[PDB]
């Protein structure tokens, strides 16, 4: 039965001999369930990419990372609770510059999103950065961090976190990889030319999913992750999180 | 005692009240608003609705379990096995009846669970399993470590999936109905496996003698089949 539930249900008072549980009373429970919703549960701003390129004297100097949630492991076990997911990605780029007193100049950065299926002749100065079809954003170092919303891009109705099958129709696709789902690459470079300064730029990319729709909840993964490409397990030698003992050991059953 | 007859065959079954519809929904034909392909799907009337009985597995005290990926066991069987390679796309549901016959002197418990989108894994290696290791065919496979469900998850939490309990006290048979679970409306028979049928002996077998063999029969009825991309 599908019904609207704003808060947890109340309790009816109880009341010789029968042919249920215990003696209860009348309680009005005002505790809100709103924070347990799938939206509130899965949606949080987390750091999915951390990279600092070495920049001192160049007289490679950028980064592109195909987005997958398996890189941040706290989010991986977070998103492996469900099978199919439907959400809109909200990306925010933060730029911090360290020192290897001069003072900090204000660099201009360009964060360009390249969808899956666009050939990239990857270079810093190559023309694929100036392509008008690719959506780009320009932001300085001192300002509110650049924030864009990525829509839901898929051939199917929702993403596949656990994919049982193989890639393509050549009968060899590296088990556990879904051909239908790849969002694309996120290309970020410094717009300014080469300045012989020893400052290191640290870019942080945050992703908060919204409009989240989940299906088929799955058991959590107790064992550690061996690799990001598949489900293989090993387990710690001693308990906990082992093959023999996942739960901690105690003295005796009567203890 | 009540017999379930669908198609040109049938099997006598034990009465079990309140069977399991997976996630509380009954499989139905593809609605018009969710359709994609503009062609006309061929609908078998009694053809794909007959009960397909796999090979009965011998269940001993030291048996870890068994798993059958759908429709991998059905890849080649009967007339439905023809439409596997004879059509480019399909969507179907499944009515699974698992019946374990034993006397009143046997003790044990069987957890029959249908795992949607089951991604397996290998122990103590980073190498992804091969093609024959995943897709068994009619033979099936045996769990190496059923306590972790071979995927690294926990068996104690496996009850979140559609399941029924086979206990040698109350009910010796189970009936599970699986609708179409996919992101896409239709899928490819030889590539992706939507469900997985896992029979896990949570409590092992026991008796006075050391050697005891209790057979298990698994029956699968592909209800609400559709097919597109006619070739050959």
């Amino acid at each position, epitope marked *: 039965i599908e019904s609207i539930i704003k808060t947890a249900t109340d309790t009816v008072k109880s009341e010789l001999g029968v042919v249920e549980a215990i003696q209860t009373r009348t309680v009005i429970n005002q505790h809100g369930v709103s924070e347990t919703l799938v939206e509130n549960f899965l949606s949080r701003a987390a750091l999915v990419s951390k990279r600092s390129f070495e920049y001192k004297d160049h007289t490679k100097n950028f980064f592109k990372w195909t987005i997958n949630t398996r890189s941040f492991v706290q989010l991986r076990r977070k998103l492996e609770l469900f099978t199919y997911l439907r959400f809109d990605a909200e990306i925010t780029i933060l730029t911090t510059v360290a020192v290897n007193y001069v003072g900090l100049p204000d660099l201009t950065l360009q964060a360009m999103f390249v969808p899956t299926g666009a050939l990239t002749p990857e270079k810093q100065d190559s023309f694929h950065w100036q392509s008008g079809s690719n959506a780009s954003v320009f932001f300085k170092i001192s300002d509110p961090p650049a924030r864009i919303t990525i829509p839901f891009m898929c051939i199917n109705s929702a993403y596949s976190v656990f994919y049982d099958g193989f890639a393509g129709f050549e009968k*060899n696709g590296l088990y556990g990889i879904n051909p239908a789902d790849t969002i694309g690459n996120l290309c970020v470079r410094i717009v300014n030319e080469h300045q012989p300064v020893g400052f290191t730029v640290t870019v942080r990319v945050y992703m908060k999913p919204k409009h989240i729709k989940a299906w088929a909840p799955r058991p959590p993964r107790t064992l550690p992750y061996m690799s990001i490409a598949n489900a293989n397990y090993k387990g710690k030698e001693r308990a906990p999180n082992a093959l023999s003992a996942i739960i901690g050991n105690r003295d005796s059953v009567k203890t | 005692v009540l017999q379930l007859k669908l198609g040109n065959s049938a099997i006598v079954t034990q009465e079990a009240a309140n069977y399991c519809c997976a996630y509380g929904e009954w499989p139905n034909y593809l609605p018009d608003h969710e359709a994609v392909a503009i062609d006309k799907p061929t609908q078998p009337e009694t053809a794909t609705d007959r009960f397909y009985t796999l090979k009965s597995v011998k269940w001993e005290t030291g048996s870890t379990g068994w798993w059958w990926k759908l429709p991998d066991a059905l890849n080649n069987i009967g007339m439905f096995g023809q439409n596997v390679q004879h059509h480019y796309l399909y969507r179907s549901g499944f009515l699974i009846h698992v019946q374990c016959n034993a006397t009143k002197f046997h003790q044990g418990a069987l957890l029959v669970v249908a795992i949607p989108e089951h991604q397996r894994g290998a122990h103590n290696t980073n*190498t992804s399993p091969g093609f024959d290791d995943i897709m068994k065919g009619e033979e099936g496979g045996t769990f190496n470590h059923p306590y972790v469900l071979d995927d690294g998850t926990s068996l104690a939490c496996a009850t979140i999936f559609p399941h029924q309990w086979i206990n040698l006290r109350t009910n010796n048979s189970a009936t599970i109905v699986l609708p179409w679970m996919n992101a896409a409306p239709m899928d490819f028979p030889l590539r992706h496996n939507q469900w997985t049928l896992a029979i896990i002996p949570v409590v092992p077998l026991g008796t006075r003698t050391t050697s005891s063999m209790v057979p298990i029969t698994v029956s699968i009825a592909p209800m609400c089949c559709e097919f597109n991309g006619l070739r050959h």
Partner: antibody
Amino acid sequence: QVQLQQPGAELVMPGASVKMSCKASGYTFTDYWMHWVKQRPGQGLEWIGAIDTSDSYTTYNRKFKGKATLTVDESSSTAYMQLISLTSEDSAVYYCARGGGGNSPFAYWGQGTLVTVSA
Amino acid sequence: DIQMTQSPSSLSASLGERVSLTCRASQDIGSSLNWLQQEPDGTIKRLIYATSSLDSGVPKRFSGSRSGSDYSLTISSLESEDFVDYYCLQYASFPLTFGAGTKLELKR
């Protein structure tokens, strides 16, 4: 400290069977995989198969499927390779490797055997 | 099955000459690849594992890098014992496969 022992010649007439032996020491044998690789005189290397040391589960090549059988013994800490229906097609140097959780590598190899069959 | 194409199958070079062997995979195997050194005496020994990292006990003259569609084995300087049969192996997915092999020759 860690090595692999696979000596012997083992010349045999066609149509017979052979059970190889790989005995590993210097580490924990039950916790690591076992592998098998053949060295042909024709300048080539083929992958025989892999076996989990724990109980049973194995993986075989399509060409050698059904002609090879792998089994291990956790007591003697040995690895055995069973072959049936030996023809003149099989002549090669069989190797056994280990692997592991990380890298699942080939790092340690055995000496190998010289296998020649003749009618 | 994923096939590893090892090229060239043979080459002729003298001492102090940098050579490279490029293997191409049909399906992307990730960062998992191995290089095996086969000595003429019948003993195979690993060299490169997981791209960058190198075996301990093996001299630093061996090196490797990834073009991102391809894998290459770069040797700084050849030696008398550096003439062997090189094999690029993929441990990423079952079944595991071998390269075609490469035999080194000396200019005479």
